[PDB]
């Protein structure tokens, strides 16, 4: 039988697990599900048939408490992070709360076999406060070529997990690497399009342009993104593949695009007028959007919408460092050599997210 | 019974045509194939158990004598193109061209099934006298967005085709619209790969850095290309399958590279110091290689090499053309969207072209 834990369970990959991994065509089913998370379940995330554990992994009692009792886990899917002022930092947390929840689990499941640790781009680009700041690797980005010399908490989790796999015989690893998430959850730290789904709702409420918050480069230089769905389906993939075991993936969409085109299609599914991008405006989410709780308490009201907070539903500070840099490209060649040949078209996907935030009663 | 007619068996998707077709795992296999071009046979094509028909396309009475007995044909493959100064007249000519071979292939071969006709990525960017100098649609191109409104002779022979098949019940057609094409093909009018290696062999023969014949944009910008086994996979696929009738595709390998990247493989597989872009060089292999026949017979002795034309082995405009602008890419997502799931690793495509000239003695 397979036994997933899913660690972030209503994060933007978590929430796609989620509803994944219970379906009947999924590979290794049928999979029983335990899904972590601090708060309180959600309502956006009972439509999937998991069993929800409340629990906050950077506390080693906690996760010895709420982890023990599931000797039946098979499967673990680690799709969560801290925030923190400075790498350094981010190294301390995110390693201690991988090694909490490894520290656990290993010892009480004895028929645990696969470990998928989601990381991401920045394993190539740096952490945030360096990312345009030091020389990378040139694009596009390959899985296996030399780390920055600079600290990530990528870095010390890949470290600690290639560690605490040799605590048992036959147990795999794998690691995926998205670049910027396309997909649903209202709780995400880096949610891109719930994010700007909010300010197009704010623009139409006031009747103003959708203007562009970033670079002549995020604008008309190429991008790509990373379907939730599709990592979920990755996760899976090389938690079942015997031919990815023990191997970092980076996975993206399979195409590229252009904010300039993806800029009209947001404003199409809000109904507001498409601004462009203005050189010498230099527009921040962050300061454009200081104030703006009562306006979202108004929409909200008006538009007969879930109760969200903005701080939670808005990340605009993620919005701001991913639109205000160029998008380096990565490969998808190692992916597609070991046998995973899933894509998506990254416009219909814009769409389908936009979408979903708009089912869930979250954006007008 | 499966029977093909290659128009342009010897040139760089022709020869891949020729090779792929005859194999026992090809889709609707067993295939018989007819190979068409002007020239005799050469050395390099007969690894191929091929039906091979000299005949000129351009002259109706050759074509009908030549053509005009082969009644089996199925699926036909149309791999050719002639080359004026104006595309007014290149019109003109493709145009007689294709329509010399379907107005005497679609009445005399009572089981035609499918016609397959290969254009390119200028359908987008424009014709050679045209690229740079018009506003195209934003890359990446998508392929059923309107026509640039500048005669194309793609637009005239989709067109003719378009017309041609009506005359057949049940007759299909497709389109194929590669990028710059890395194969095989000493006969070829567009060969980067072997136009690259030709250049590389001068520069090791006279101890001679391999610098870098094109633009900044071409240099560190990127790019992309066709591989030539996989556009003649894609034509296997369009023609054979139900589901991809009667539609225009893009075909490109699935990921996309650097020349700055590319420029290292190129010396390190000639043993040549590898040069780098220089600014302000404005470097053109027409101008650098002019006279250089007696040095390309030395080469050819001195290193037992196929006796070869250094005109007809080496296209220095064309690599001039591709390098001397930036590379706009194009999107794989109908093809995929339609089950073709092909790629290619674009770097070991290269080596593996680069090597296959080496191996039929076209270079050292
Ligand atoms: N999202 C993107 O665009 C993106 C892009 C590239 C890479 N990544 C990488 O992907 C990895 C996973 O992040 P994600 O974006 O998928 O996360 P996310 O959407 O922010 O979700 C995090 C999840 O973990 C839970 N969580 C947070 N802290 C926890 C703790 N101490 N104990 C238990 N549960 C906790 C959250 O719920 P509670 O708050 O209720 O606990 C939520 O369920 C990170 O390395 C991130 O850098 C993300
Ligand atoms: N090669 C590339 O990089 C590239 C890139 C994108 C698009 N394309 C497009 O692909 C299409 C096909 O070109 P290709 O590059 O595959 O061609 P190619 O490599 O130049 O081969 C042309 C073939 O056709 C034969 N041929 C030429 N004129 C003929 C005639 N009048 N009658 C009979 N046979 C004739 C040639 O042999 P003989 O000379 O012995 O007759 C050779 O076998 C064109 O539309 C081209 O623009 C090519
Ligand atoms: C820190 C800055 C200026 C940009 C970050 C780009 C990005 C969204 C990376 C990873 O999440
Ligand atoms: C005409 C110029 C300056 C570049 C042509 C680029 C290219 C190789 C297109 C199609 O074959
Ligand atoms: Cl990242
Ligand atoms: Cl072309
Ligand atoms: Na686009
Ligand atoms: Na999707
Ligand atoms: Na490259
Ligand atoms: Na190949």
Redesign the interface.
Not at 254 to 258: L, P, Q, T
């Given at each position: 039988s397979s036994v997933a834990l899913i660690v972030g369970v209503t994060g933007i990959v978590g929430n796609s697990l989620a509803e994944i991994l219970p379906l009947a065509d999924t590979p290794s089913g049928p999979w029983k599900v335990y899904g972590v998370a601090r708060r309180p379940r959600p309502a956006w995330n009972e439509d999937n048939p998991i069993n929800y554990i409340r629990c906050d992994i950077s506390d080693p009692k906690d996760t010895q408490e709420k982890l023990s009792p599931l000797t039946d886990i098979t499967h673990v899917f680690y799709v969560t992070w801290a925030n923190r002022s400075t790498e350094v930092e981010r190294c301390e947390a995110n390693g201690k709360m991988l090694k909490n929840v490894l520290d656990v689990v290993i010892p009480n499941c004895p028929d645990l076999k696969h470990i998928s640790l989601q990381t991401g781009r920045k394993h190539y680009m740096g952490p945030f406060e360096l990312i345009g700041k030091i020389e990378t690797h040139?694009?596009?980005f390959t899985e296996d070529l030399p780390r920055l010399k600079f600290d990530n908490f990528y870095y010390t989790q890949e470290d600690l997990l290639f560690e605490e796999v040799e605590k048992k015989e036959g147990l795999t690893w794998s690691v995926h690497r998205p670049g910027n998430i396309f997909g649903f959850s209202p709780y995400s730290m880096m949610n891109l399009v719930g994010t700007l789904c909010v300010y197009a709702a704010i623009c139409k409420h006031e009747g103003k342009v959708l203007r562009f918050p970033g670079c002549k480069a995020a604008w008309?230089g190429?991008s790509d993104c990373s379907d939730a769905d599709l990592i979920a389906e990755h996760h899976i993939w090389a938690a079942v593949d015997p031919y990815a075991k023990n191997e970092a993936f980076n996975v993206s969409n399979?195409?590229?695009?252009?904010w300039?085109?993806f800029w009209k299609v947001l404003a199409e599914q809000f109904g507001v007028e498409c601004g462009e991008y203005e050189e010498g405006e230099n527009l921040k989410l962050q300061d454009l959007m200081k104030g703006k709780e009562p306006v979202w308490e108004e929409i909200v009201r008006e538009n007969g919408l879930a109760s969200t907070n903005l701080e939670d539903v808005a990340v605009w500070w993620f919005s701001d460092a991913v639109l205000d840099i160029p998008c380096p490209?990565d490969?998808?060649?190692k992916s597609?050599?070991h046998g995973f040949?899933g894509?998506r078209?990254s416009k219909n996907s814009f769409i389908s997210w936009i979408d979903k935030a708009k089912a869930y009663k979250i954006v007008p």
């Open positions: 040139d694009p596009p008309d190429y399979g195409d590229v695009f252009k300039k085109h490209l490969s998808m060649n597609k050599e040949l894509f078209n």
